[PDB]
Chains A and B, each alone.
With several copies, the nearest count.
Chain A
Amino acid sequence: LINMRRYRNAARKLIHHYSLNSTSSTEYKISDVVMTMIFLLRSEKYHSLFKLLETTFDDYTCRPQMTQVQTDTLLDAVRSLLEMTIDLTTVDIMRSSFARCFNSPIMRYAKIVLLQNVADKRTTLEELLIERGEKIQMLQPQQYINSGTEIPFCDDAEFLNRLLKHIDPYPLSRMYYNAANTMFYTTMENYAVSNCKFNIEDYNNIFKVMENI
């Protein structure tokens, strides 16, 4: 037989990484994918997920269509595995990432890539901006802030010092790492779901601007 826990945790790790929630970036090998896919094969409660893996193995240029109950079971199983929320878009990310990993041949490195093959009409950034303006500006705001509302500064100096000491051991650099990776992930995800060309070039230009000023 085999050890349930190791394959299970490998599958969890891989689904976290391709779902991009795990901003913790970690290397992967054919060993890791083998472990994850073995887990999915042996996991009866995740057999639907495994058959989706088998579909991803194929030409993968056409998402299989599933009943609504099949979608719900797929979501529940992935939520049990990851141990959460999740949705269909994360499943599409799973499908594309798995398919592209299959399309990667045996290799001694890793090919850095970006979200794609997700969501069908190709949209541009400019008319997407215009369209989102159409949608937003037709919405009456629900929320009111009245008067020159004073900014409630917490002058509780002892509280400031207590918070500072509590967060003092925190390795400030790594919070930057996590947050910056997470904003990058949000940007790619939104551009990919909208299917808009991800202008990673201007995303970098943002940091260039930060540096210069």
Chain B
Amino acid sequence: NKVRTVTEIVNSDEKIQKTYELAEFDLKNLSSLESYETLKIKLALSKYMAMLSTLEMTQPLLEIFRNKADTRQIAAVVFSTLAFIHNRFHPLVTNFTNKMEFVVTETNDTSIPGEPILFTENEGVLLCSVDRPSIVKMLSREFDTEALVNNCNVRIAKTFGASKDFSITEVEATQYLTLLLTVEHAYLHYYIFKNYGVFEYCKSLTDHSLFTNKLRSTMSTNLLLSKFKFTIEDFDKINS
């Protein structure tokens, strides 16, 4: 609220009193927090793409995914992405189960809605279901990197107070963000798997609210997505 700090000299009763609107300093705190979060997210993406480049990815991700034949590359990239995510949740950890396998789904008969990437252990080791057509169409989706997406007074304040080379655009930034988010959700599912059993994996897949139960205990002790809040436009009426 308000703080009225008193400046005076004990020699005489002469006293001075300044009210201090804590709102401005809370706003400075919020602005520093948002800047730091943006920086950390952008540097996580920078590290991810840099290690992808060190992964001898020649053709950009888009036509890596268009590539049906080079399943070697698909397995390498998915393994690297899941490694990066687990390292994000486990900076100490940088390597996984010795043996790993990858399986690709190339049709509706093989591809599931909601979770194009899945896992179902062969009872000895976990296998990486990956729906190439789904991500192919995902990235193929035209993108909106021009129309900015969103309290009005504080917005004006942050605007005016805000005193505003290898070939890459912001479109591939969108692409890599989308890949990281999808693999993040899938890796959360697989965390549920490894930590509680295949049945619990299945139920969490059926009920993502169970991720709150199983990761409010662990993950929060956060998500890349948790930087912002997300919903559906006019979700209230949508629900009805």
A and B in contact, CB less than 8 Å: yes
Instruction: Say whether B110 contacts A129, CB under 8 Å.
Output: no
Closest to A193 in B: B108
Interchain nearest-CB distance for B22 vs A (Å)? 14
Contact of B207 among A196, A198, A202 (CB under 8 A): A202
Contacts of A20 in B (CB 8 A): 141
Instruction: Say whether A149 contacts B234, CB under 8 Å.
Output: no
Contacts of B111 in A (CB 8 A): 132, 190, 194
Instruction: Say whether B211 contacts A190, CB under 8 Å.
Output: no
Instruction: Say whether B227 contacts A184, CB under 8 Å.
Output: no
Contacts of B50 in A (CB 8 A): 154, 156, 159-160, 163
Contact of A136 among B83, B105, B174, B207 (CB under 8 A): B105
Instruction: Say whether B235 contacts A200, CB under 8 Å.
Output: yes
Contact of A126 among B110, B144, B206 (CB under 8 A): B206
Contacts of A174 in B (CB 8 A): 144-148, 170, 174
Q: 1/0 contact trace for B129-142 toward A, CB 8 Å? A: 10000110111111
Q: 1/0 contact trace for B202-223 toward A, CB 8 Å? A: 1001111101100110011011
Closest to A122 in B: B29
Is residue B11 contacting chain A, with contact meaning CB distance below 8 A? no
Q: 1/0 contact trace for A177-209 toward B, CB 8 Å? A: 111111111110111011010111111111111
Instruction: Say whether A112 contacts B103, CB under 8 Å.
Output: no
Instruction: Say whether A135 contacts B143, CB under 8 Å.
Output: no
Closest to A111 in B: B233
Is residue B1 contacting chain A, with contact meaning CB distance below 8 A? no
Closest to B218 in A: A213
The A interface, classified by DSSP as helix, strand, loop or mixed, is helix
Instruction: Say whether B42 contacts A172, CB under 8 Å.
Output: yes
Instruction: Say whether A23 contacts B113, CB under 8 Å.
Output: no
* A116 CA / B228 CA spacing, docked (Å): 6
Contact of B103 among A117, A143, A179, A204 (CB under 8 A): A143
Instruction: Say whether B238 contacts A154, CB under 8 Å.
Output: no
Closest to B143 in A: A178
Q: Given that A115-B230, A148-B96, A156-B50 are known contacts, is A200 also in contact with B239, CB under 8 Å in the complex?
A: yes
Is residue A146 contacting chain B, with contact meaning CB distance below 8 A? yes
Is residue B64 contacting chain A, with contact meaning CB distance below 8 A? no
Interchain nearest-CB distance for A92 vs B (Å)? 12
Instruction: Say whether A164 contacts B42, CB under 8 Å.
Output: yes
Interface residues of A in 112-153 (CB under 8 A from B): 112-117, 125-153
Q: Given that A129-B202, A142-B104, A213-B216 are known contacts, is A190 also in contact with B142, CB under 8 Å in the complex?
A: no
Instruction: Say whether B120 contacts A133, CB under 8 Å.
Output: yes
Contacts of B97 in A (CB 8 A): 148
Contacts of A206 in B (CB 8 A): 185, 208, 211
Interchain nearest-CB distance for B234 vs A (Å)? 3
Instruction: Say whether B155 contacts A130, CB under 8 Å.
Output: yes
Instruction: Say whether A201 contacts B142, CB under 8 Å.
Output: no
Instruction: Say whether A126 contacts B212, CB under 8 Å.
Output: no
Instruction: Say whether A168 contacts B228, CB under 8 Å.
Output: no
Instruction: Say whether A152 contacts B142, CB under 8 Å.
Output: no
Interchain nearest-CB distance for B153 vs A (Å)? 7
Interchain nearest-CB distance for B236 vs A (Å)? 10
Is residue A25 contacting chain B, with contact meaning CB distance below 8 A? yes
Chain A residues near B (Cβ < 8 Å): 16, 20-25, 85, 110-117, 125-154, 156, 159-160, 162-164, 166-168, 170-187, 189-191, 193-194, 196, 198-213
For the complex of A and B, 3 pairs with smallest distance between CB atoms: A190-B113, A154-B50, A112-B234
Q: Give me 14 A-to-B residue pairs in the complex whose CB atoms sit less than 8 angstroms apart, sorted by A's number.
A: A129-B159, A133-B160, A150-B94, A154-B53, A174-B144, A174-B146, A175-B174, A200-B232, A201-B239, A206-B185, A209-B208, A210-B230, A213-B211, A213-B220
Q: A174-B174, A204-B231 are in contact. List 8 more A-B contacts (CB 8 A).
A: A85-B140, A130-B156, A143-B101, A152-B80, A176-B177, A196-B113, A199-B114, A202-B208
